[PDB]
Design a protein around this ligand. Structure first.
Ligand SMILES: Cc1cn([C@H]2C[C@H](O)[C@@H](COP(=O)(O)OP(=O)(O)OP(=O)(O)O)O2)c(=O)[nH]c1=O
Ligand SMILES: Cc1cn([C@H]2C[C@H](O)[C@@H](COP(=O)(O)OP(=O)(O)OP(=O)(O)O)O2)c(=O)[nH]c1=O
Ligand SMILES: [Ca+2]
Ligand SMILES: [Ca+2]
Ligand SMILES: [Ca+2]
Ligand SMILES: [Ca+2]
Lengths: 367, 367
DNA sequence: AAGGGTCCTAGGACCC
DNA sequence: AAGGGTCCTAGGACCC
């Protein structure tokens, strides 16, 4: 029943990538820019008040020296993300990706294998690597403590390999399920790691100050919960199961109430190859003219290049748009003879276009 | 490029099943009844005017002696259907099911293997089994003719095994793709088979009298086509690709126009185990009372029994309803602890019920 | 008042 | 005027 899960979360991911390619940007407050948004920044820039997802206007207002590099093309970040996932896959094959810079690994089989190689002597010598959440005391006679400490040791090897082999720093969190691993990985956050022993699980979930900090409780779910007088984790822990069910759904309810107790039986999923390939362009209604075709052609070339280099081929294409004021989309299957190119593909999309501040294309249904 | 496909289609399937279990019902006009609908009938009953999908009222008006057996529980038909598919799977593993009584098999690899065992002597001795569509003359020096005749020979073995091993008769159609195999299988229809040589493909598609007879052109697509002045297969063959595209979709258009030429590159799919498990009950608004729970409990017991006997377990449940006057449905994931029962499951469904002439339950998302 | 199936679509909620 | 992802849902079109 008892699992040992690790959650890995890279430091200022995009900024770290740019800092690696241009070693200079180190020691200097660095922001990575996407249109008007400083999507992230390195930790220098955070000392000087810059925050993640901050308008470029406010970002300089706080840091007029902030160096900005453009991060609208994700290619280099996407490439590093998969190098990280591939490296962790060497440790244990079942690695679940979450976004570009997080990975879960179920270390359970691994922890168990390392224990069978030890004796009663080695067992009393087992030590933690990194922080223990809430400064909790360890009990070496507690098998669960021993296994989570072995997890912490695997997590440090992972982070060390990530640095030695890819030049990347990040955090790790080790716990008994994915929810808790992800919540504990951020407790000590610049390039460090934390392990959560079970006795401190309630301290961890009650350290949160609003329910949206629970992975799985988003903007909409949070809004509906405060509208019911639910604000703290304990409020959600103690709320009526029935009212919850019959307010936002038996699905949402029974799951986010379980989460509110630190419970989560979800398995670590093997993410494997991507399920989709998309690109976007945003603009200040900078498209009013069906010559919008050009934007779509540009998105095409990139996507076709990424697909070709993947190796599989998609069987569905989708076009997404946003109208000034809530996105809309039209998809259609891809014809057989095309699947084995620009000219046919753009004609497809323009008809999907004409059937209907942002333009996007998605290739999915990959085989 | 060139395939040899077989399409198998059982005679008066439900009626045949009932006739087997109760050998008496043979020689007697037999109708299988579902509420007010004689869903099918044996061929005796068809001589006397009974037709498939005919009200029981009209069915006796034509045949006041018509014996009727109730076919609302599909269990025995479902069981035979899979015995048929399993038998054809012995011939070639990739068998595609369509409904309960049709199967496609790609005989291409099989045909080719049998040819390599023959010599120029055996090649001039190759004969057809069954009918040749349109009485077309065979050219033994035509490799395509030879391969489709070998297909016709495999199709006769299949039908013979189906009879010797399962007591079931049906038709087969052999052609170069699934569309044409399915259209030619019905040309000689009580327990016979037909092979389509390529020179007669246009004769086959133009033998149809309305476009809805094309598999893939349904009620809605047909209605929209007649509304555009499209009525014959040739009308659809010759219609504007552009207008078609921009009237019902690049998907629907480019595909049903291809079909209208007898073209179809769709592969034979391995259907394998079912993707869902559902049951239904219909009634003359015989449910106005949330004691509708009982109907749902009854559907449950059966579905739980079928699932348990399958071996896999579902991860989604769905409830469907129809209101007097266009169906509606609510689904939700299945909780982990239940998946490994009646009481929890019915409570799930009643809340899905209350969130909302027919009641149905579906188990899908099987793992 | 059939009684089943397969697969696609537009959208939505969540994650980073 | 971010720029990406994963997965679910209610419905719809088709097949028998
Ligand atoms: C949340 C989020 C992340 N990202 C990108 C940029 C981030 O570098 C990357 C990972 O996001 P985060 O891990 O959430 O932030 P971070 O890695 O940049 O900084 P931290 O050290 O606190 O973890 O994903 C977006 O582009 N948009 C978003 O809304
Ligand atoms: C088309 C159809 C079939 N069925 C069932 C009953 C049929 O026995 C079975 C197969 O249908 P069909 O093969 O279309 O008809 P049939 O097999 O009964 O008669 P035939 O010899 O002409 O092929 O599926 C329905 O219940 N409802 C329907 O709408
Ligand atoms: Ca992160
Ligand atoms: Ca991060
Ligand atoms: Ca049939
Ligand atoms: Ca039939």
């Amino acid at each position: 029943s008892s699992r040992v899960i690790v959650h890995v979360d890279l430091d200022c991911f995009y900024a770290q990538v740019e800092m690696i390619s241009n070693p200079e940007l180190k020691d200097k407050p660095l922001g990575v820019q996407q249109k008007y948004l400083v999507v992230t920044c390195n930790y220098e820039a955070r000392k000087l008040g810059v925050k993640k997802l901050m308008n470029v206007r406010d970002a300089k207002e706080k840091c007029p020296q902030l160096v900005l590099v453009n991060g609208e093309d994700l290619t280099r970040y996407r490439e590093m993300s998969y190098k990280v996932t591939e490296l962790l896959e060497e440790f244990s094959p079942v690695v679940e990706r979450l976004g570009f810079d997080e990975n879960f690994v179920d270390l359970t089989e691994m922890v168990e294998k390392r224990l069978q190689q030890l004796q009663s002597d080695e067992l009393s010598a087992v030590t933690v690597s990194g922080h223990v959440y809430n400064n909790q005391s360890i009990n070496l006679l507690d098998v669960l403590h021993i296994r989570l400490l072995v997890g912490s040791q695997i997590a440090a090897e992972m982070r060390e390999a990530m640095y030695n082999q890819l030049g990347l720093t990040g955090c790790a969190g080790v716990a008994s399920n994915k929810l808790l691993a992800k919540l504990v990985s951020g407790v000590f956050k610049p390039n460090q790691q934390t392990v959560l022993l079970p006795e401190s699980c309630q301290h961890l979930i009650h350290s949160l100050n609003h329910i949206k900090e629970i992975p799985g409780i988003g903007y909409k779910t949070a809004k509906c919960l405060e509208a019911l007088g639910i604000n703290s984790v304990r409020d959600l822990q103690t709320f009526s199961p029935k009212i919850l069910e019959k307010e936002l759904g038996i699905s949402v309810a029974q799951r986010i109430q379980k989460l509110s107790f630190g419970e989560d039986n979800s398995p670590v999923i093997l993410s494997g190859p991507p399920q989709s390939f998309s690109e976007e362009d945003s603009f200040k209604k900078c498209s009013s003219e069906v010559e919008a075709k050009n934007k779509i052609e540009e998105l095409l070339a990139s996507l076709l290049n990424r697909v070709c280099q993947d190796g599989r081929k998609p069987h569905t294409v989708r076009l997404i748009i946003r109208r000034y004021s809530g996105r809309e989309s039209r998809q259609c299957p891809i014809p057989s003879h095309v699947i084995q190119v620009m000219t046919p593909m753009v004609d497809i999309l323009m008809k999907l276009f004409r059937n209907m501040t942002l333009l996007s294309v998605c290739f999915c249904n990959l085989k």
